[PDB]
Amino acid sequence: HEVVKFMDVYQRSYCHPIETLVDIFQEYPDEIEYIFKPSCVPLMRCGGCCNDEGLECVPTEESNITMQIMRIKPHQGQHIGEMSFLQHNKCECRPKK
Amino acid sequence: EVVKFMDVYQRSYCHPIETLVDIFQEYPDEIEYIFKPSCVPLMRCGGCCNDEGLECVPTEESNITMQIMRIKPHQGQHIGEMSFLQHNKCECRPKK
Amino acid sequence: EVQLLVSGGGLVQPGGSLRLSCAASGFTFKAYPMMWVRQAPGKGLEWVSEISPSGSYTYYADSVKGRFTISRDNSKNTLYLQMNSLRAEDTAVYYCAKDPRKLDYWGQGTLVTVSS
Amino acid sequence: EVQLLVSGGGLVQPGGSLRLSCAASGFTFKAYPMMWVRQAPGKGLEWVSEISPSGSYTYYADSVKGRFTISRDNSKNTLYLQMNSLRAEDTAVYYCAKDPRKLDYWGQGTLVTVS
C-alpha cells in the first residue's frame, strides 16, 4: 500500500529539526579564494511549516558541531583542516512580529 | 566527538534525502485554497558532487499519495488524497 | 516551561455528553492555534479538531463534525472540547497540544469510555 | 553496470614500493574524478587520495602525501597509485572508487601488508 495518513503527514511536516545538506559558500561567504571538498555538509536545521499565517518555524535552542573538511587554495596546496558549523537543536513556531 | 572526513564525504554525497516541500511549489494554480499542512515530506535529490562539471540529478522517479486537507476560507474543508513526485535514486551526471 | 493539563473525562452513556478542559501555561497561548487528537485502543492516532488563535475559525474531522464543539478562553488560557451524542467509536484517550509532534505530557491524556 | 577492478597489492618490507591498478568500466570514466580509500583491520575507513577528471589536479591525505602518487589514463580507463616508502601504519585493504558509499563491488579491494 502507498498512501500516507493525514496525522502522519501532519506530524512529519510540522516545524522540527531535520537533516539538511548545506553548501559551505553560504555559511562562509568571505572565502572566495578557497574551494572546499566536500562543498556541502549535513546539519540539523529547522525545516517544516507552521499552523498559521502569523507563525514561522524558528530555532529556540542551538548548538555547534565540528567536522573534518578540506580547504583547497587554487594551485597553492590544500589541507584537511577542521571547521565548526551551526546546527539547530530544537525548533518551534513563533509569531513573525 | 568530531565527525571524520570519510563520514562527511560519504553522508554529504548526492543521495535521496527526506525533504520538506510546499504544496504551492508543486501546485501553483491553487490560489483560491489553503492546504494544511502546507509542506509535505518527500524524498528528493539532496547533496553535492565531486567536480564543478557534475550535477546531482534524479535517475529514477515515482509517485506517492498522501491525505491532505484542502480549506476554502469560510466555506468548509475536506481531507482528500493528493499525489506527489519523489525520487527513488540520484546520480551525478555531466552538466552539459 | 510548557504545561498542558486536561480533565473532565471518564465513563458515559450512548448519546450522552462530556466537556474536556485543557489548562495551558508556559507559552503565549493566545498566539497559537490549538487542537485535539485521540487514540483508540489497538489503533493509530486520529485528528479530531482545530481552533484558530483568535477563535474565529474552527475545524473538525469528517467523523465528529456536527456533534463536537471546540472553543477557547484566551484570557483564562484554556481549550475546551464539548463532546455530544457519543457512540461506541468515540472511545479513546484524548490529547490536547499546540505542537502535534510532542505528546504525552502528564496532563495531556484523559481516557474517555462509552459504556454499554 | 559499474565494475571497479583493482590489482597490485600484496606483501613488502618497510621502505618498500608498490603500484596499484584500478580498471574501471560501465560509465564515462573521462568525466568523473576518482579516488582511493583504505580500511585497516579494526579501524574505520580512511580517505587516501583523489584525481580530477582531466588529470591535471591531484589531492592527497596528510598521512601519506609526498610518498604516494596518483595518476590516471583516460584512454585506457585505468586509475593508478604509486605507493613508495611504506610503513606499518599503511597496512590496510585498498579500495578504488568513483563514488564513496560503494565499496560493495567485486575485486574492488586489495590487501597491502607491511612486515
Author numbering:
A (entry chain W): 12 to 108
B (entry chain V): 13 to 108
C (entry chain C): 1 to 116
D (entry chain B): 1 to 115
What does the original paper state about this entry?
The various VEGF-A isoforms are all active as homodimers, differing principally in their size and their ability to bind heparin or accessory proteins called neuropilins. Domain antibodies are the smallest (11–15 kDa) antigen binding fragments of immunoglobulins. We have developed the dual dAb architecture using VEGF dAbs fused to human IgG1 domain and demonstrated high affinity binding of VEGF dual dAb to human, mouse, rabbit, and pig VEGF. The VEGF dual dAb is unique in its ability to sequester two VEGF dimers per molecule, most likely by a “side-on” engagement mechanism, whereas other common VEGF inhibitors only engage with VEGF in multiples of a 1:1 interaction.
In both cases the complex appears to be a symmetric dimer of VEGF with two molecules of Vκ·dAb or VH·dAb bound. Vκ·dAb binding overlaps spatially with that of VH·dAb although orientation of the dAbs are clearly different in the two complexes. A more detailed view of interface between dAbs and VEGF1–107 shows that Vκ·dAb interactions with VEGF are concentrated on complementarity determining regions, whereas the framework of VH·dAb is also involved in the paratope. The C-terminal Cα atoms of the VH·dAbs (these present at the N-terminal junction of the dAb with the Fc region in the full-length VEGF dual dAb) in the co-crystal structure are ∼81 Å apart. Orientating the C-terminal residues of the dAbs against the N-terminal linkers of VEGF dual dAb shows that the distance between the N-terminal residues of the linkers is too short to enable them to attach to the dAbs when bound to VEGF unless the linkers are in an extremely extended conformation, the likelihood of which is very low. When considering the end-on mode of engagement, in silico modeling studies demonstrate that it is highly unlikely that the two VH·dAbs at the N terminus of VEGF dual dAb could bind simultaneously to a single VEGF dimer, although it is possible for the Vκ·dAbs at the C terminus to do so (2:1 and 4:1 input molar ratios of dual dAb-VEGF). The top half showed reduced affinity, largely due to a more rapid dissociation rate, whereas the bottom half showed very similar VEGF affinity to the full VEGF dual dAb (data not shown). When considering the side-on mode of engagement, in silico modeling studies demonstrate that it is possible for a single VH·dAb at the N terminus and a single Vκ·dAb at the C terminus of VEGF dual dAb to bind to one VEGF dimer simultaneously. It can reasonably be assumed that this would be possible on both halves of an intact molecule of VEGF dual dAb; therefore, we predict that a single molecule of VEGF dual dAb is most likely to bind to two VEGF dimers via the side on mode of engagement, and this is consistent with the observed SEC-MALLS data.
